């Protein structure tokens, strides 16, 4: 409804906005399509411009900044003067800037604070993930390093954390959204899919590092059969770490719902805890599309499958 840019208000030009995020996505993504007459052409929107989308929030019905990022790419058509943007929050910067860091044994929160301090990234008070990580040397992107240590934190019994940018970097635990919205009331169509596609019933740990930690921790072998994996990570250097990694991998296969909603719940985001029918599910992916009729589509799943796949 309001698109601030730097100074102007280009909400008087946009054909539609689509706010999309994935649980493992690089960044909260806003793809706003505009018509580009002389008026919009004058201001000369370039890549790197700062877009802030403001719309009436679902919670309190007050205008709140639902998106605050930067224009990552502009594509302009000439025959039809339709300028199209693809906005990203500043976690896209972290996913592109490579750097090598050597880390001793420590927790994920300390590592994230170290990254932010090194690269001068503003950040709120980061939640203590608690889990203690093994010494590693990293080379991938900063977001890649953060995701790697968060995955290793999900292993060893730690809670599932996800990093979202907003104005200043936030360490967002998955099941900690304020409002557990119920989608059954506006359920245009749902697609309950169940499978054994990524089911894990057994896991045979073969430790590449010593405390000779080896074991098997089959959990539902009698019911679904011995759907076995082999976890052979150097980071597992402990018997309890092996047991917790095994326990953080068992699941009954893929179990998700491809939900389609006729009303756009504005504040939904990846990782949020949302209800369909009596059950509760975590948002694997959300794709708003703020056309003339607000609309939302969701892909949600159980905790076990999400932990198995994305962690």
């Amino acid at each position: 409804k309001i698109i601030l840019n730097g100074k102007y208000d280009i909400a008087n030009f946009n054909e539609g906005i689509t706010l999309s995020e994935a649980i493992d996505g690089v960044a909260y993504k806003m793809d706003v399509s505009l018509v580009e007459p002389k008026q919009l052409k004058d201001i000369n929107i370039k890549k790197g411009d700062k877009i802030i989308l403001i719309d009436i929030a679902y919670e309190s019905k007050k205008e709140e900044t639902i998106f605050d990022g930067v224009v990552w790419e502009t594509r302009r058509s000439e025959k039809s003067k339709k300028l199209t943007l693809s906005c990203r929050e500043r976690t896209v910067y972290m996913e592109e800037s490579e750097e090598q860091y050597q880390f001793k044994e420590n927790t994920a929160t300390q590592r994230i604070e170290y990254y932010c301090k090194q690269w001068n990234i503003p950040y709120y008070n980061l939640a203590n993930t608690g889990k203690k990580l093994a010494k590693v040397i990293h080379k991938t992107n900063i977001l890649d390093m953060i995701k790697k240590d968060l995955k290793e934190t999900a292993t060893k019994g730690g809670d599932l954390f996800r990093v979202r940018m907003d104005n200043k970097l936030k360490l967002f635990k998955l099941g900690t959204n304020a409002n557990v919205y119920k989608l059954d009331s506006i359920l245009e169509d749902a697609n309950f899919t169940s499978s054994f596609n990524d089911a894990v019933t057994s896991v045979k740990v073969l430790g590449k590092s010593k405390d000779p930690i080896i074991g098997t921790y089959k959990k539902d072998a009698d019911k679904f059969g011995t759907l076995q994996k082999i976890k052979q990570d150097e980071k597992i250097k402990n018997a309890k770490e092996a047991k917790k990694a095994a326990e953080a991998m068992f699941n009954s296969g893929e179990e998700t719902i491809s939900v389609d909603c006729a009303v756009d719940i504005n504040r939904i985001r990846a990782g949020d805890k949302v209800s369909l029918k009596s059950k509760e599910y975590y948002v694997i992916d959300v794709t708003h599309t703020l056309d003339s009729r607000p609309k939302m589509k969701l892909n949600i799943g159980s905790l076990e499958y999400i932990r198995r796949k994305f962690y």
Binding site: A22, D24, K204, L206, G207, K208, S209, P212, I214, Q232
Partner: protein, 56 residues
């Protein structure tokens, strides 16, 4: 289309892990059963050694 990307990324990790298996230096310990290499379920009963390790 995110499902295709996730499946393909899983295939990336699968293929890379399979290619890296059975390659590079690894730690091990000697046992009565034979060599016991870290990250291997079974002991290797037939293995080679450097000739400087065969000293009396």
């Amino acid at each position: 289309f995110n499902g295709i990307a996730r499946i393909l990324k899983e295939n990336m990790n699968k293929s890379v892990a399979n290619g890296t298996f059975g390659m590079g230096c690894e730690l091990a310990e000697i046992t009565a059963n034979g060599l016991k290499v870290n990250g291997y379920k079974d002991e290797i009963q037939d293995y080679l050694v450097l000739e400087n390790l065969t000293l009396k």
